[PDB]
Symmetry: C5
């Protein structure tokens, strides 16, 4: 529909990570990782699989102000609790005899989105013959083509802690009413590098000065913040994730 | 000679996904190469077709037109699709140690794209001129020792998909007057892959004088190579892994003298 | 606080400060180091020694009172810019004392591994949010750590809010600056984790950070005080034996301030 | 050398292009672009490297159209390393990374350097070891002392012969080269990954603060390069330097001088 | 008071490194590093300690007859001989059987300054109980506090080859009349990364448009360029240093 003239409120929210949480005391961690399954019998357990975080954020009803819609203009966001990884005394395997614990390191994924509706996602699989567990939503009727680009695998990030990170990326051919940003760093011993500052703002307005338009007086925040692998004294490995903070500035926009 | 920009229906967007062409050794390993061999003498180097990753290319047809009118490519949005699929450490990859997770994809990688008004122009360079390339590949014809450095005979068009091996060919900086190309190669056993996705990033394709690629025959050419690293199997065999690349291109009608 | 016009002089002032690090100080001779790090404590049995936990540094700098009376425009000090650097980085080029040989007949092992470089400047104490690796850790007397933690303290638990109101008491491993508050401060930090991460530290008297927000307003010093805060964990020192210690260094601050008018 | 006005109108601009080959040592007719195997652990008192083990600076004089006063002025250069994807061949020659693995990538110490000047590059000599005995066909610092291992102002030369000046003996001289522009990056290490970019969208302006470029004496332009990509590890454990060609495209204009 | 800009001279100098020079032949190298000395008994040899380089450059007298001083406006600088490190055939331990020699690598420090008086140093020590050798100038009467900040340790860089790099840094609380720039990179395996170009200039003017002012007609250059460690065949290690070029553009400035 036709976007018209601008006619200014802040929302803030703290999205928890969904790393698998194998029992209550391991909130923020996945189950121990399995290794060396044949592509032809790869059946990962639910609690081993990090999933995308999402929340529907209700916004003030605009009935007392064609229509009006909230417009997202800017967001400030950071990963919460980065210094917790300076605890090298709890749970982690010694680097060597008499040494402290092994830092969280290895492959990591840091990702956020702000939109006027659920994030649109595309499925890609490492191994199309993976049997995903109950409580996950993964590409339906995958083929070999699902290990590169198969355009049947389209979804909405419409449920929290359901869509595994290894199965889904944001869809660049859609997401007209959202902005998203992500960096993947892969490797056995990659160091995590995380920055905090209250002086960083991201602008959400497009080439024509229009931010995401909030449908049904709601916005969707999305995140995945896999910080790396935690190595237990036994040699077992677990994903560790951290919460993400969002502060979103919005203004009223007339539409038709 | 390039004249005036034109100004209803003087703008068009086209979008597509290019699939990677890494070798596809069997019906279930689409997006991977055959296991890499090692330590072949220069005198007896005969790589199998399915071990060799190839440049991806496609020709996108644009609406016909008629001091000629041509479509001009102004901006591109591109990312690699499926970067999170590397967070599956449970399938096929060798354990990092006893009781450990699978080894992540890592090692030598190459990220490349191009947008042109005609096929990408390539220069051939070889690690080993005596390498014997298999049927189904197109490689520098009749190379010499000189072909291991610069040999100006090795000129080709990226004019066929899944045929031009990445290890044999580079974009030619002495040509490609009607195209824009971007590439980064990172070599090493342990190189971490580092990949960014956002729908807010745009490359401008216009040159110093405000002209983008002009599409001959109302056709646009997209080119890619996205080798993400090596997958290490439980046995210790390694394979290339690749991913698809998204393109969105904004074009505009431009007038040209005959 | 409704903000009005910048005054112009006798309108401008500069304060400077050297903040020492609080790495734990295990004995009289090892100022700037932690106790030997322990390893492999079960989450159900994790009681770290006071001297093993580096803490945030903080200092309160007194400023000149500006108001003849408070009876309906106040003057306040506004922080505009800061120069800051880590003091003594070249001390890590001592490879002859205490550090394990890299191999037979080799130099000592450089300081390396996980590090955290953090600073802030505010018109009030830094506001902090608690997050724990392990909510079952038993923290020692003389530290201030998240009260009544649950499993949610391993992710985000909005109950863990604190003021950095005391030097050498808030452990770096329990607390981050709170991006949901600190309306009247500016903070900057980088965490780099890994067993063999190289330290990369720059010194120059030519670098300035601007503390003004989008509206051109800097931190406003309530009660004629400026709060500086730092954490500079440089990495891990590996002794002959194989035991490791955090090493930390002091941070310089030079802050320029101007007189700003406010309503009330 | 008094500089006056930039000349104007038709035929006031020219454009030269050059593919400069690397000079890595070429130990036999088939190993064009490599060095001889690296020796190791020679005492400083008895260090006598074989010529084919020593990479040298590349250079060429490019002759320009005769003008006579007018001189050609170099204003821009586009430059690129050629064949960077050739390092994705891990099947030929190189030591396997482990049992059943691919070949070991080229990695380690690397040097990427180019220059554009209106006369030969001016160079300063600096030795790791002043007692090194250099072989026939190489040009190295004369009568070096222990001071040659730091700064000896005696060691001035012109880059006036291709494949003669060893890269280990010479650096561009920042106290001279008023009539040239040089750019280099040294990365040292046993395992450093090579990182190389290609794009036809990057230009270096060669104009100084006053807006003056290299003025081309005796209607000559001097290009210079060193592109040591890293070390190739043969399956026996021997190592060789691997070099690549460098492309130049230089835009020039006529400048008035008295 | 700093008055008006009155014309122009250029000074140049190549400042040698001071790495320890253990014998006549090993100019530009330290003595083999010792390891594992107790804090309570750490007595390093003179020839093992790299020191700061400095030189006072004499300028033309201005006020033979508002007074005039020389103002330093720009500097071009680079490290000289970076390519010498491509000699892997001399002295260095092989990387493996039949392999080339081990490149120089590990901890490095690259620093320069330009002032109109001597560089002002602050003392900080790894180990305050270190006993420093004759021929060096180090913090007087140090305490534990000398391992962090101890304001007693102030000194002018007044003597070439005397102030050990490991004991001193530029003082950011002082040096109103100099500009300094330095990077430390620590670690066993750190690669040296060095750039050369005759097209890079550092501007030395401050916020108010004023460069360093040469107090009594002299300009002071300071440097330390520790490139990393050379590993001999035996396994022993020595610092390697390189000279630094400076070209400094100066202009006449009126003062009170
Ligand atoms: Cl699906
Ligand atoms: Cl050909
Ligand atoms: Cl609390
Ligand atoms: Cl000479
Ligand atoms: Cl002192």
């Amino acid at each position: 529909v036709e976007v018209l003239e601008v006619k200014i409120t802040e929302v803030e929210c703290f999205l928890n990570p969904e790393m698998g949480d194998p029992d209550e005391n391991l909130r923020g961690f996945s189950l121990n990782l399995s290794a060396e399954n044949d592509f032809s019998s790869d059946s990962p357990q639910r609690k081993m699989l990090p999933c995308y975080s999402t929340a529907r954020i209700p916004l003030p009803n605009l009935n007392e102000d064609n229509l009006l819609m909230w417009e997202a203009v800017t967001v400030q966001t950071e990963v919460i609790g980065i210094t917790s990884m300076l605890n090298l005394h709890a749970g982690s395997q010694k680097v060597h005899e008499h040494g402290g614990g092994k830092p969280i390191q290895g492959s990591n994924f840091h990702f956020f989105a702000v939109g006027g509706e659920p994030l649109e996602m595309q499925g890609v699989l490492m191994n199309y013959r993976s049997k995903y567990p109950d409580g996950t939503i993964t590409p339906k009727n995958p083929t070999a083509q699902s290990q590169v680009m198969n355009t049947d695998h389209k979804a909405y990030l419409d449920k929290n802690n359901a869509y595994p990170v290894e199965c889904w990326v944001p869809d660049p051919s859609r997401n007209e009413n959202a902005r998203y940003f992500g960096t993947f760093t892969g490797g056995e011993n990659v160091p995590p590098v995380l920055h905090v500052t209250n002086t960083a703002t991201t602008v959400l307005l497009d080439e024509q000065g229009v931010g995401p338009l909030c449908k049904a007086d709601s916005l969707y925040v999305s995140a995945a913040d896999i910080c790396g692998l935690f190595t237990n004294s036994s040699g077992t490995q677990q994903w560790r994730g951290l919460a993400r903070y969002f502060k979103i500035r919005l203004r009223k926009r007339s539409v038709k």
